[PDB]
Amino acid sequence: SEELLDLFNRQVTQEFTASQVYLSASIWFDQNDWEGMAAYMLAESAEEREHGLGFVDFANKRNIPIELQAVPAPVSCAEWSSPEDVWQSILELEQANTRSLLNLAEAASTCHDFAVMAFLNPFHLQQVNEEDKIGSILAKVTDENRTPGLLRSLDVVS
Amino acid sequence: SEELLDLFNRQVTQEFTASQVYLSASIWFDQNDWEGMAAYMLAESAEEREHGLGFVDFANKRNIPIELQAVPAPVSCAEWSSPEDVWQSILELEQANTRSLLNLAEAASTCHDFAVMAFLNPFHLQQVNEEDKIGSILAKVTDENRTPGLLRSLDVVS
Amino acid sequence: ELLDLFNRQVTQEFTASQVYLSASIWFDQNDWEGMAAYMLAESAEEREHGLGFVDFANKRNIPIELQAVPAPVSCAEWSSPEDVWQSILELEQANTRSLLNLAEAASTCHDFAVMAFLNPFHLQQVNEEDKIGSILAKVTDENRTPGLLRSLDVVS
Amino acid sequence: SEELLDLFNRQVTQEFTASQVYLSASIWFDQNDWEGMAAYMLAESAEEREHGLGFVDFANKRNIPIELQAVPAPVSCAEWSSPEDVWQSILELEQANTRSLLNLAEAASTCHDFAVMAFLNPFHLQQVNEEDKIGSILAKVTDENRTPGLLRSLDVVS
Amino acid sequence: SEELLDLFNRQVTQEFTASQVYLSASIWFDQNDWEGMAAYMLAESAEEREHGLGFVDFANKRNIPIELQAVPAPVSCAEWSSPEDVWQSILELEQANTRSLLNLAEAASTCHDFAVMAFLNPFHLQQVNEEDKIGSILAKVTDENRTPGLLRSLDVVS
Amino acid sequence: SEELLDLFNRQVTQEFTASQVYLSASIWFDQNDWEGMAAYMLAESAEEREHGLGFVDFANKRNIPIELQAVPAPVSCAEWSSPEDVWQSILELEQANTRSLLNLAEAASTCHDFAVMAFLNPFHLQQVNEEDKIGSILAKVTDENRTPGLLRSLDVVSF
Ligand SMILES: [Fe+3]
Ligand SMILES: [Fe+3]
Ligand SMILES: [Fe+3]
Ligand SMILES: [Fe+3]
Ligand SMILES: [Fe+3]
Incomplete structure (x- = not known):
């Protein structure tokens, strides 16, 4: 009932919000000549949008x-000063995406909505992989950023 | 300078705003079982977003x-009652996209910004084709919907 | 005489090319893009026939x-696809009549090469008139129900 | 805009007019046994026609x-006595084609019609190549025609 | 137009001057064992000369x-001591190439010379890409050069 | 030592000078509707620049x-008025390219610079080929131009 439909709508918005945040990160990366990191954020921006479209398609089929x-304006980009700040906001965004999906999943569970729970399962597994991947990139960036110039090698070796 | 930089920004928002309105058209069609029309709207939705990404890429390269x-919530979907209403809104959306591009070209012309005018040319020719295509679909839809059920065998066909 | 009719056959073919072009424009302006592509194809083809007549005349020292090439004028009167296909039928019947007058003059002159040259065009006019006749019948039938004709432009 | 629409129509007429002039040049060449020159004129005839069709198609799309x-009768074909006279009328025809496009572009520029201007750009560049190719052919014809019979080998070698 | 003709000639000179400057940069790089950077300048040297040849060809067709x-002796090579200095001179070279194209387009616009302006459009767009790319290399160079030896490891690589 | 380094630099400048002279010839040919001859001059312009690049690369490797x-403005174009004039200036350019190469070789030989001499050998042989080629075209151009229009036939035909 109500809470479930509402959360499914919010999930669509969260996916497109995240897509815009990834686009703001590619913009900061490009503007500051990190083309490899910008290409990476641009691909994640397209992927988040695809996840939004997948939820809209399921909702349409399920008459949700x-x-x-x-879609809110991204806000973090005014205060980014280094690649480390961007990859940190991106980790947070993915933690927020994971929480969003777990909130929706909990509502489906309370309703015994087994179709919505089945639908969410690949996204739960994807978030695990996504958080791991961004956590790992952030670790590399924060270690390499300790020697002036050395991080430019991460980007170049794209 | 000021005017041009702000209108170029605003163009990106107009492209993503059109993307979202196409997406809302695609949902209204899917919810009302016009899968052929929904797929067309969904394709234009991706294409509008690629135009916005092409504007972002150029502005990065040109230090704009x-x-x-x-990205504003689409609103015409609350009033849509038939395919005709949707296509008519999509026609007004493309006429605004075209006006928005002409405004920007007018500012570039004023600033003698040859690069920006060159970048915009293919978009002006594309809006010519888009408005014609949408006008033509709308003419078809409005003719066919004069007989009950007949429009439904166009969605299914074309 | 014969030489005058041959010259005028060239003009008839290019006139018909232009009328088919005017029909293509009416259809496109009115969002019948399948009928417009068919008219445009016929327009190229009538000009090809005109060029075929020119080439033969040059070879034959005619x-x-x-x-x-006169401005098409039927376009001002067209309101529906039926009117356009009706004008195109009449154009083809005209085309046919001008070939037959030409063949008639060649026959009177015992001009066996001209007559042989015309033979494939006489047979092609029979096919053309039948095909236009048949499209016009289909158009007239479907247009009895609102929107239905549209559904068959698109299935083209 | 009166003006723009009238000049757009005239541009269509000028393309079909030039197509008929090239056809008259092909006939005079063929009648005087210059088959290679005749083939070249015939190719240009079909091409000028194709240009006229492209203008019609754009006009239809843009609701012009x-x-x-x-299509007025070609008139120069009554006074041509040699290939030189033909290629000279054909140079003049291309100079008139260029001037007609330039008229149309001026009108479009005055209206700020960026779509029309963009549409004409490839034609402006094609006229540059056309005038130069015709001009060079005419120079070769004029030089070789100084020796009786020698021009008849330009034709054979084409 | 005297102005338009003089500026078209100066554009040709500017392309071949830029070609020599890029060649001077390759030589400086090779003498100091930066083989990768040197190969890059040599490729640009060739392509600058190709642009010059494209302007010459158009001029000849348009009877300009x-x-x-x-073509002036390059003089910055006397002052270069590190790769940063070379890349900075190359950025300023490309900003002057953009400025000379812009002076040309301005005079063409003034004369209403639609074919010249059509001809320059791809060059405007290419100058955007070129200034962005060099800016971006120069940012990478200035950043890597902060750690002794680091720059070397990335000529070897990219 | 010094003369050898100077002459090696002069040889680079000479290659680029010849490249620009060939380009000026291509322009005069195109302006006068000899597109065959123009394409030939243009291909020579690029090749001379490749020679110049060849000398630069060697000099860098050898610490010269x-x-x-x-690169001075090409001067002969101002007075050319028939393809014969252009081809004669090109013959003279190639004879001058040959002399500068022989001077350079001479200097290399006095210095016992065996590497420079080795490097120059294919260019000496190339020049023999080039003078013969330009001299042969010029003979044909001068013969055919005795009949009005005839030379035009062999821009169109040959090249
Ligand atoms: Fe993600
Ligand atoms: Fe669109
Ligand atoms: Fe027919
Ligand atoms: Fe033409
Ligand atoms: Fe460049």
Whole structure:
């Protein structure tokens, strides 16, 4: 009932929000001549959008009415000063994406909505991989950023 | 300078705003079982987003700062009652996209910004084709929907 | 005489090319893109016939002088695809009549090469009139129900 | 805009007019047994026609009403006595084609019609190549025609 | 236009001057064992000369008389001591190449010379890419050069 | 030592000078509608620049300091008025390219610079080929131009 439809709508918005945040990260990367890191964020921006579209398609099939919400402007990009700040906001965004999916999953569970739970399972497994991957990149960036110039090698060896 | 940089920014928002409205058209069609029309709207939705990414890429290369704005909630979907209403809204959306590109070209012309005018040319020719295509679909849809059920065998066919 | 009719056959073919072009424009402006592509194809083909007549005339020492190709005027009167296909039928019947007058003059002159040259065009006019006749019948039938004709432009 | 639409129509007429002039040049060549020159004129005839069709197609898309005019009879073919006279009328025809496009571009520039200007760009560049190719052919014809019979080998070697 | 002709000639000189400057940069790189950077300057040297040849070809077709000027001895090589200095001079070279294209386009616009402006459009867009790329290399160079030896390890690589 | 380093730099400048002279010839040919001859001159312009690049690369490897000089504006185009004039200036350019190579070789030989001499050998042989080729085209051009229009036939035909 109500809470479930609402959370499924919010999930769509969270996916497109995340897509815009990834695009703001590619912009900061490009503007500061980190083309490899910018290419990476641009691909994640397309992927998040694809996840949003996948939820909209399932909702349409399941008669969960979707209504598209505004997609908020990304906010972190005004205060980024180094690749480490960007990859840190990106880790947080993925932690927020994981929480969003777990909130939706908990509502489906309370409702015994077994179809919604089955649908969510590959996304739960994807978030595990995604958080791991971004955590790992952030570790490399924070270690390499200890020697002036050395991080430019991570980007170049794309 | 000021005017041009801000209108270029705003163009990115218009492209993503059109993407979202196409997406809302695609949902209304899917919810009302016009899968053929929904797939067309969904393809234009991706394409509008690629235009916005092409504007972002150019602005990065030309050091035009991009600040990504909220993408507004689509609103015409509350009023849509038939395919005709949707296509008519999609026609007004493309006419606004075209006006928005002409405004930007007018500012570039004023600033003598030859690079920006060159970048915009293929978009002006593409809006010519888009408005014609949408006008034509709308004419078809409005003719066919004069007989009950007949429009439903166009979605299924084309 | 014969030489005059041959010259005028060239003008008839290029006139018909232009009328088919005017029909293609009416269809496109009115969002019948499948009928417009068919008219446009016929427009190229009528000009090809005109060029076939020119080439033969040159080979045969028949002096070709190119005349004005008149502005199509039926376009001003067309309101539905039926009107356009009706004008195209009439254009083809005209095309047929001008070939037959030409063949008639060649026959009176015992001009066996001209007559042999015309033979494939006489047979092609029979096919063309039948095909237009048949499209016009289909158009007239489908247009009895609102929107239905549209559904068959698109299935083209 | 009166002006723009009238000049757009005239541009269509000029393309079909040039197509008929090339056809008259092909006929004079063939009648005087210059088959290689005749083939070249015939190719240019079909091409000028294709240009006219491209203008019609764009006009239709952009809702510029086209009303086909009479295609006037070629007149130069009564006074040509040699290949030189033909290639000279054909140079003049291409100079007139260029001037007509330039008229149309001026009108479009005055209206700020960026779509029309963009559409004409490849034609402006094609006219540059056309005038130079015709001009060079004419120079070769004029030089070789100084020796009786020698021009008849330009033709054979084409 | 005297102005338009003089500026078209100066564009040709500027392309071949930039070609020599890039060649001077390759020589400086090779003498100091930066073989990768040297290969890059040599590739640009060739491509600058190709641009010059493209302007010459258009001029000849458009009957703009080209008179070839002295190509000046490159002088910055006297002051370069590190790769950063070379890349900085190359950025300024490309900003001057953009500025000379812009002076040309300005005079073409003034004369309403639509074919010249069509001709320059791809070059405007290429100058955007070129200034962005060199800026981006120069950022990478200035950053890596902060640690002794680090720059070397990335000429060897990229 | 010094003369050898100077002459090696002069040889680079000479290659680029010849490249620009061939380019001026291609321009005069195109402006005068000899597109065959123009394409030939243009291909020679690029090849002369490749020779110049060849000398630069060798000089860098061998620690011969190269200072790039101005490439002077081509001068003969101002007075050319038939393809014969152009081809004769090109013959003279190639004869001058040959002499500068022989001077350079001479200097290399006095210095016992065996590596420089080795490097120059394929260019000496190339020049023999080039003078013969330009001299042969010039003979054909001068013969055919005795009949009005005839030379035009062999721009179109040959090249
Ligand atoms: Fe993700
Ligand atoms: Fe669109
Ligand atoms: Fe027919
Ligand atoms: Fe033409
Ligand atoms: Fe460059």
